[PDB]
Amino acid sequence: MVISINQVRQLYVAKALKANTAALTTAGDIVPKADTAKTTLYFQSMSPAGIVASDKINLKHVLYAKATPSEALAHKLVRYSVTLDADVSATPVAGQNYILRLAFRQYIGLSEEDQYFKYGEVIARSGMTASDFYKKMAISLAKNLENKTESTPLVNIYLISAAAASTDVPVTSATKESDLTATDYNQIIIEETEQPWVLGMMPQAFIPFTPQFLTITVDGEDRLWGVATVVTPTKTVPDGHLIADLEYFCMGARGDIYRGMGYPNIIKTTYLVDPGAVYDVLDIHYFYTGSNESVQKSEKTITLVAVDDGSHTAMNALIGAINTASGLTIATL
Amino acid sequence: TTIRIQHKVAGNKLNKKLAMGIPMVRNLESGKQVKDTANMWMHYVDWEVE
Amino acid sequence: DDPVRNKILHPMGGVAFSYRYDIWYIGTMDQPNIFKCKIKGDNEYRGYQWGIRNPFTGQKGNPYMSFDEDSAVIHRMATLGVCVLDPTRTMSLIPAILQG
Amino acid sequence: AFGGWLNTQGGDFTNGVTFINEGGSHEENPYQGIQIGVDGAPNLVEQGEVVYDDYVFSDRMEIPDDIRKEYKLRGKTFAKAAKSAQRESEERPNDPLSTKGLQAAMERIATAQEEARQRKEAHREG
Amino acid sequence: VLSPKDIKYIETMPDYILLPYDLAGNLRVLRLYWKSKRKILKVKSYDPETGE
Amino acid sequence: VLSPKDIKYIETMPDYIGQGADEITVRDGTYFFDLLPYDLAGNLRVLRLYWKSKRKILKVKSYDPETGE
Amino acid sequence: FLNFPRQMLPFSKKTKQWRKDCLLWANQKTFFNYSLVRKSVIHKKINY
């Protein structure tokens, strides 16, 4: 993906801490190097084809040096609690068509003018309980949205019973009426889905929606049918696909600017980030001033990325190594 | 009410020819992405600033 | 009906700004009631500061340098307003879900 | 159109040599030539021949070595030998010395071509 | 050379008895003149009568 | 005498400049921000060099045919 | 547009929209000249 930069951004992956340049053995190692007079900070990093350093950070010219946890870069897949509005009728009115419209907004193109509209439908009948209704509409909402033949995954749709009320039973295009055997269904949960991701060419982007109801007559009045309230999300996508795209962009600042343009003829850069793991980010943002009447700042930033194992041990060892060599107050997260 | 804009490019982009792997598009005033065929990069820089 | 700026949806579908009724012109007024105030003479200042190259104007070699870096910034600015002489000649009708 | 002309400074300056091109040979042309003049009425020229002072240097002939060591020609053809004697005067057409240098050299290849015509006619009639 | 659409724009202008109008009800007329480049051909033609 | 490659150099050139005496803007409506081949007006450096070279020529002594002069 | 629209064209490609793109450029990017043998407009207006 393409990001915005403050005039440059270069990324190093902190796979190891070796404390000196003579112990750099495998690819992706990191030492934070500085001298006794704490005026320059740089990172002798072991690339897959030798040892390489960074631009030399003047420690009087840092602006912010903030390290972020891996929980702060997870997109929370939003949910909606679709229920029966009890003000119109607590029971499904036995003759009406009960239709619900999903209004998607990023479709196959980014603007909110590229839209997509999908529907679920249940004819309500006499004696049909509300639990027999949500058993009948989550199937009809799954047959249109959780289908096998759609172009892109749109939503994930569950049912919530009144007994458990915390676990979600998934409803798909293959689930029948006999598989969902429960008589206390009270809502339909419509959750976002993670879209497909390709390294460098297809960024991590999502499709939002809004469950909108249609009008069903009660005593002559065409009253809107239901209510949809944004309940708190319980599923998040990891940081694996943002940092995997972040090494793909920032390697073109230190290296070749094009990536595959003409393929008998490219410089194959080997990347170090596994896209299947979560990662922490540390951004040392600084500048370069001179000594003249033309002095002021050419602003820069250096991103260091270490692997996150649950309690951020591989990142905090890097912060604990930068704090002693350079003497900065980077907050150990 | 007084508004302002700002955009910055390097001086390297003076006559940088766009070898179009994907065709370079313009953003219209309508919102549509229209296709363009101008090989210079700076035609798509002052068009997005007006 | 523009859904890029209008983000609140109406309960009956569409954006909430679609249900807003505006009668801009009530009768004739003998002068323009709504007009776009623009300053006479304030053309927008197209203004570039640059260094040794200028990628916009296409100038190689600069006699008067602002600074010493390969850069070229555009600065443009416009002073602008509008005026409605008689807002009592104009009746509106706004949905309350736009919250005034 | 570059044929023996110096089109510079808005003006069209010639040294006298007419590079008659673009037509073709005598037998390829509808008219059978460029018909430069009707002054013999069919005065017909081809794509290779050059003209100086209404004298035509033929491209069909060749340069014998007995009239190469004398008269001091440089090209392989009489047309290509008149195309090399004008190389100095084609860039300085108003020069007094070069217009003397061109007129003196064109009379030599005139006497070089006329000697080749009489020695050929003696060969065929003999 | 004015089309009947362009007479209406002169006609529908607001009664003022970047900026298309004046406060004397006038019209901003911008004449632009430029020197474009055009492709011509220089042809050298042997006249049939003389040779010039 | 100009080639069409040389017209393409003439065509791609500066022809507009911008305001002139982060920029601080002063003066209100009239905002004021606070051997090279173009003139910052859209002109071209026509440098013309005239020089006296050397030419080898010959002085030749000949005789008039009719009188021995 | 970036500059004045390309003048090194054949005559058939100087269509209705090529001439209008030329004239729309004069509407926008023709207010500020480093005139080499003229004074400023604010200087001349003070003189009158």
UniProtKB/Swiss-Prot annotation, chain A:
- Keywords attached to this entry: Capsid decoration protein, Capsid protein, Virion
Cellular compartments per GO CC: viral capsid, decoration
For the region FD, what residue ranges are annotated? 75-237
Q: Which cysteines are joined by disulfide bonds?
A: none
Q: Where in the cell is it found?
A: Virion
Highest taxon above the source species: Viruses
Quaternary state and interactors: Interacts (via FD region) with the major capsid protein.
Q: What does this protein do?
A: Auxiliary capsid protein that forms an outer layer on the major capsid protein protrusions.
In the record's own words, the domains note is: The central region FD is structurally similar to Helicobacter pylori flagellar cap protein FliD.
What's the protein here called?
A: Auxiliary capsid protein
Curated annotation (Swiss-Prot), chain B:
Could you name the domain of life of the organism this protein comes from?
Viruses
Q: Where in the cell is it found?
A: Virion
Subunit structure, interactors included: Interacts with the auxiliary capsid protein (via FD region). Interacts with the head fiber dimeric protein. Interacts with the head fiber trimeric protein. Interacts with the portal vertex auxiliary protein.
Instruction: Share any extra remarks.
Output: Displays an HK-97-like fold with an insertion domain that protrudes at the capsid surface.
- State the function annotated in the UniProt record: Capsid protein self-assembles to form an icosahedral capsid, with a T=9 symmetry, about 77 nm in diameter. Each asymmetric capsid nonamer is covered by 9 capsid auxiliary protein, 1 copy of the trimeric head fiber protein and 2 copies of the dimeric head fiber protein.
Q: What's the protein here called?
A: Major capsid protein
Organism of this sequence: Bacteroides phage crAss001 (Bacteroides phage PhiCrAss001)
Which residues of the complete protein appear here? Answer: 203 to 252 of 504
Curated annotation (Swiss-Prot), chain D:
Stretches for region Interaction with the portal protein? 1-126
Query: Where found in the cell?
Result: Virion; Host membrane
Report the protein's function. Protein that is stored in high quantity in the viral capsid and may play a role during ejection.
Q: How does it assemble?
A: Homododecamer. Interacts with the portal protein.
Q: What is this protein called?
A: Cargo protein 1
Curated annotation (Swiss-Prot), chain F:
State its location(s). Virion
The domain of life for this entry's organism is: Viruses
Per UniProt, subunit arrangement is: Homododecamer. Interacts with the Cargo protein 1. Interacts with the major capsid protein.
Q: Which purpose does this protein serve, as stated in its record?
A: Forms the portal vertex of the capsid. Probably involved in head assembly, genome packaging, tail attachment, and genome ejection.
User: Which protein is depicted?
Assistant: Portal protein
Q: Write down the species.
A: Bacteroides phage crAss001
Per the UniProt record, the lineage of the source organism begins with: Viruses, Duplodnaviria, Heunggongvirae, Uroviricota, Caudoviricetes
Q: Show which stretch of the intact protein is covered.
A: 253 to 353 of 806
